[PDB]
């Protein structure tokens, strides 16, 4: 029946009633290191809540604490990813039972305090929000937020309903819910999520009980009563019927559609709807509405795509899934960066920010200084906005040493080369520093296409030569593509793997093939757009198809960044990479468009003119002559065809990389495509997109193949699916 239980598991909550009658519910799940919202917790909190109601006459207050390093964070992701549309009833009743426990604990008629010792994320913060007072220990690593939206879910444990009641529709959505922002305890108290702070975890429970004692003394009637359970409650910013909010309320779905650029992410749409519809009714009816939207998301395919990529795949990467087994940790004392371009300067920045000592070499002291100015202007932006101190920024810049003498690479044990994309140049740059650095030094290269095996012949210690591929802007791109040459040792992989985590980035390990995985797959994306441009499709529809597919940058705009002259060089390198290898090349339709733009002196933003027009550096509108050059408008295919063509090309090329052994795991394929070339997160990755494809044909891998054949009939045989995707 209607109860605090759902429908054998261990106990999660320790019970303790003191002399004064304050009950301490200490969460300590014995089946893991972190308190997690699972079947065991629900049954445990159910027993505890039943006991709080039974012994109400001898209970004056409640304190919710945790025995772990963290307060409470996460859920049974192994379970929610398996929820089917027919399971929507069970999913609804589960979150309804969870909120029925918190609502009883909330309307207990006595104060309940949350002693937040560590990370209170999502379901954990949803527990604390059910309390009447929240105290947090201001310790390192502690975070608070509702990041359910980043997994395709929504805060279905009262998170949406309560944050709206506390902050209003606009603030709760924009600041907390829509992006699942994690807050440090200082910022948490600042915006109102936490009420007061303490310096250490030991002071929490004594301060929690002291607040309960003082509250029952000063505020007797208002004790154990939330603001929305009092008469005369006024929601901040007003309700949807309030004339002030009702004027700007229609812009919330349109502003949200503008930020998502039309991408099919159903989570923020559901959060906004559940937030508004929840503010139109009472608290209980609002939470039940919140449950129905939560059951809508969990049964959806996108939630499975994101739970696969941003939970299981990302943890398999951080656990060392691609790091060789057995190899141990090796320190890094001095990083030597050859080259001070936007790549070399960013590499020096992200390394010095991690605390590493950097030597930034370039062919001139003037250029190496300009490279360090990148880190100075980056800290200036970080000091104007006030995200760092004046003293920590001085120590960061002091760790970077610009130079032009190859003798200053003495004592370097980690070399990262970022010179021009040329093999004989890289052979010389490495040849004159390999004897100056340490004998165990890592000789890393930042090349985008040129195979590592060829570049490694320029050094004698080839087992320490390895590809360390970054992405610009280096201070913001989170992926590092580590390429394994056929001479690179497994120890060299692990050292670069550990270095990548040390600078706060996510690594993937890739075997040495031309184009690697990121540059090769993003090329198929750009080439599909240029092919559509040559076919006569409107340029605005192409950029719309990219933004609506979920890409961060539209394809033609990115084609000006990547420089069209470089694209011509890659096409020539791929042609003679198989022409001089005994066969003939299949020229992509985009190659003709690349060369027509090159002929017209429009090679991209670097030239100052490309598919767009550039004035004062800033991009400003598509080139007006573009429509007449390629007869734009003569071909008007469906927008979903343009969207699917770009997504399928990358998905199929990703499948090729797995079939060729370029990638060793789909987790590297998904996270690599998402963090490396900006594949849409709702897809869950270019490999997850295959198994999670949902269209008019249906859902599954077989639906993907049928759709790939449909595209292959009308657009070209490059969309024909590989043998590995068939029965």
């Amino acid at each position: 029946g209607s109860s605090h239980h759902h429908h054998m598991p261990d106990n999660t909550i320790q019970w303790d009633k003191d002399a004064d009658g304050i009950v301490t519910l200490t969460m300590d799940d014995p089946s893991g290191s972190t308190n997690v919202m699972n079947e065991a917790y629900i049954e445990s909190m159910g027993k505890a809540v039943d006991r709080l109601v039974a012994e109400k006459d001898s209970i004056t207050g409640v304190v919710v604490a945790s025995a772990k390093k963290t307060f409470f964070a996460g859920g049974d992701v192994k379970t929610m990813i398996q929820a089917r549309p027919e399971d929507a009833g069970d999913v609804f009743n589960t979150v309804e039972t969870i909120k029925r426990q918190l609502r009883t604990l909330e309307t207990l008629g006595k104060p309940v305090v949350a002693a937040i010792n560590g990370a209170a994320l999502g379901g954990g913060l949803e527990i604390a929000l059910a309390c009447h007072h929240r105290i947090a220990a201001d310790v390192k690593g502690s975070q608070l937020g509702l990041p359910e939206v980043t997994l395709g879910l929504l805060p279905g444990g009262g998170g949406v309903t309560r944050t709206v009641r506390m902050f209003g529709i606009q603030n709760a959505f924009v600041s907390v819910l829509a992006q699942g922002t994690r807050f440090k305890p200082a910022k948490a108290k600042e915006i109102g999520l936490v009420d007061e702070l303490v310096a250490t975890v030991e002071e929490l429970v004594p301060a929690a009980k002291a607040w309960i004692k003082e509250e029952l003394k000063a505020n007797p009637d208002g004790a154990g009563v939330q603001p929305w359970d009092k008469k005369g409650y006024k929601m901040p910013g007003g309700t949807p019927s309030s004339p002030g909010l009702a004027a700007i309320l229609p812009s919330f779905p349109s502003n949200l559609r503008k930020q998502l650029k039309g991408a099919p992410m159903p989570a923020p749409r559901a959060i906004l709807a559940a937030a508004v519809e929840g503010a139109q009714v009472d608290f209980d009816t609002a939470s039940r509405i919140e449950s129905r939207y939560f059951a809508s998301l969990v049964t959806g395919q996108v939630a499975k795509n994101m739970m696969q990529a941003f939970f299981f795949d990302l943890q398999a990467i951080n656990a060392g899934g691609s790091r060789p087994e057995g190899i141990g940790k090796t320190p890094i004392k001095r990083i030597g960066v050859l080259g001070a371009g936007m790549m070399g300067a960013g590499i020096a920045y992200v390394s010095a920010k991690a605390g590493y000592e950097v030597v930034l070499k370039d062919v001139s002291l003037e250029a190496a200084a300009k490279g360090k100015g990148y880190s100075e202007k980056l800290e200036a932006k970080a000091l104007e906005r006030g995200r760092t101190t004046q003293e920590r920024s001085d120590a960061l810049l002091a760790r970077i040493t610009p130079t032009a003498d190859a003798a200053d690479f003495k004592g370097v044990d980690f070399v990262i080369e970022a010179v021009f994309e040329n093999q004989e140049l890289k052979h010389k740059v490495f040849g004159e520093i390999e004897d100056i650095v340490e004998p165990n030094a890592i000789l890393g290269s930042n090349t985008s296409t040129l195979p590592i095996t060829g570049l490694a012949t320029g050094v004698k210690r080839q087992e320490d030569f390895i590809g360390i591929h970054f992405f610009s802007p280096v201070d913001k791109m989170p992926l590092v593509e580590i390429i394994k040459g056929e001479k690179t040792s497994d120890e060299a992989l692990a050292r670069v793997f550990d270095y990548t985590l040390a600078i706060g980035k996510t690594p993937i390990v890739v075997n040495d093939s031309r184009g690697f995985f990121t540059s090769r797959v993003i090329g198929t994306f750009v080439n599909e757009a240029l092919a559509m441009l040559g076919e006569g499709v409107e340029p605005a529809s192409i950029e719309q198809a990219g933004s609506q597919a979920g890409y961060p940058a539209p394809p033609l705009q990115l084609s000006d960044e990547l420089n069209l002259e470089l694209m011509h060089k890659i096409a020539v390198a791929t042609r003679k990479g198989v022409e001089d290898a005994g066969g003939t090349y299949q020229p992509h339709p985009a190659e003709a468009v690349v060369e027509k733009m090159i002929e017209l002196g429009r090679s991209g933003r670097l030239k100052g003119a490309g598919f767009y027009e550039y004035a004062d550096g800033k991009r400003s509108g598509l080139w007006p002559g573009l429509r007449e050059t390629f007869k734009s408008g003569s071909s008007q295919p469906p927008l979903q065809d343009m969207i699917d063509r770009m997504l399928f090309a990358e998905a199929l090329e990703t499948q090729k990389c797995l079939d060729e052994g370029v990638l060793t795991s789909t987790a590297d394929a998904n996270i690599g495509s998402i963090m490396g070339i900006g594949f849409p997160p709702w897809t869950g990755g270019s490999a997850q997109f295959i198994v999670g494809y949902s269209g008019p044909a249906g859902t599954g891998k077989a639906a993907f193949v049928a759709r790939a054949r449909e595209l292959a009939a009308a657009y070209g045989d490059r969309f024909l699916p590989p043998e590995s995707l068939l029965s």
């Binding site: 309320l249 949200l256 650029k261 749409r269 529809s541 719309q544």
Partner: protein
């Protein structure tokens, strides 16, 4: 079977929004004044024969709630059997009230019907009633809601209507409305509004700026400049940027006003000694995409022509509501309307667009202009919010 005839078609002057003359006047009082005028025109009219009173009202709240038509029946002392019903089809509520009144006459289940509309936008601004497609994110996100003003800028962007092109039409409406007033065209149909003492409150359309120059229209700023721009282009992906051409000088005016039309069968009119002034030939409803919104008239006007076996060359006068300048120019471009057959006495850009009453105002305006010109046919149509459209053809008798 039966035929529907228009015996009377009057309206109030259109008082402007800022410091307007009709702001102190309740919208109910505006409709009552038109009922009291219809009594003056026919004091021996048997009001028992009036079987329904249909009023359009787009924002039916506040002073305009509680079936404002029924309140007009009771406050004006009309027989309690005379019905009274409010409807809302956005910008066409005034004309949909007339069309519904005619369709009730043709069905043989209604004898003599009053129809029109009322909208005191200075007292009840549009959006006051709320709405799902605006204040509900689930359906707003799905229907791609975009205000009418941006769809108008998109029409001008697609069709290639410059800022000079729309302002050139705004001046045309201002000039032809001043000529119609100076020429005395509106004298018998615009019933001045008076207070409970008989003192004059308003006798002319205030929103008119007859001393308008093309140089002054260019000084105005594009007033309609959220993410609605990006929401619109997500549907119309082949358009790169929206050229915001519409200002307060080439868009419909925000005013107060009311209109009334008497419609009945030939037997009902002959029973009361009424002279029919026009006959409702046909009606039709049809629309287009809700994002661009204001392209609904073109299929509705084509449909009302195919239903009556007529073409553009059979129509002597076209009257499209001047909600936005680009809407009329787009309408003139599609059906190839002659320039001297289109909104001949000015329109909403000069005199105003009182949502609920505009449909019945321009309807009566064509009745008075067919008789003044001794012409035969006229077509009335309006664009609607949400992507709808209505059209009506009348014939002079």
């Amino acid at each position: 079977s039966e035929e529907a005839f228009i015996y009377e078609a009057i309206r109030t002057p259109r008082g402007k929004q800022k410091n307007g003359s009709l702001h102190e006047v309740k919208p109910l009082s505006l409709v009552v004044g038109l009922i009291d005028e219809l009594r003056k025109r026919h004091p021996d009219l048997d009001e028992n024969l009036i079987s329904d009173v249909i009023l359009g009202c787009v924002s039916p709240v506040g002073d305009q709630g509680g079936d404002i038509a029924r309140a007009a029946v009771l406050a004006s002392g009309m027989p309690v059997t005379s019905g009274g019903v409010q409807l809302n089809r956005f910008c066409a509520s005034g004309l949909e009230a007339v069309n519904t009144a005619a369709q009730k006459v043709r069905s043989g289940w209604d004898d003599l019907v009053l129809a029109g509309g009322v909208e005191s936008m200075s007292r009840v601004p549009m959006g006051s009633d709320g709405g799902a497609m605006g204040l509900d994110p689930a359906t707003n996100y799905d229907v791609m809601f975009v205000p009418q003003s941006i769809g108008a800028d998109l029409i001008a962007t697609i069709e290639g209507f410059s800022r000079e092109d729309v302002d050139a039409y705004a001046l045309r409406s201002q000039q032809k409305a001043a000529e119609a007033w100076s020429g005395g065209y509106f004298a018998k149909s615009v019933v001045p509004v008076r207070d409970q003492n008989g003192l004059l409150i308003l006798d002319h359309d205030e929103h008119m700026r007859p001393d308008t120059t093309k140089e002054g229209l260019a000084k105005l700023k594009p007033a309609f400049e959220g993410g609605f721009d990006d929401v619109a282009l997500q549907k119309y992906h082949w358009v790169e940027k929206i050229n915001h051409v519409h200002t307060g000088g080439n868009s419909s005016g925000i005013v107060d006003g009311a209109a009334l039309v008497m419609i009945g069968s030939a037997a009902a009119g002959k029973l009361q000694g009424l002279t029919p002034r026009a006959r409702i030939v046909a009606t039709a409803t049809s629309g287009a995409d809700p994002v661009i919104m204001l392209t609904g008239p073109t299929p509705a006007t084509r449909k009302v022509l195919d239903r009556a076996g007529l073409t553009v060359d059979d129509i002597d006068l076209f009257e499209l509501n001047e909600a936005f300048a680009s809407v009329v120019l787009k309408f003139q471009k599609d059906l190839n309307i002659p320039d001297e057959k289109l909104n001949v006495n000015g329109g909403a850009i000069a005199m105003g667009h009182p949502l609920g009453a505009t449909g019945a105002m321009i309807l009566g305006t064509m009745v008075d202009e067919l008789e003044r010109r001794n012409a035969r046919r006229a077509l009335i149509t309006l664009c609607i919010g949400g992507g709808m459209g209505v059209a009506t053809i009348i014939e002079r008798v």
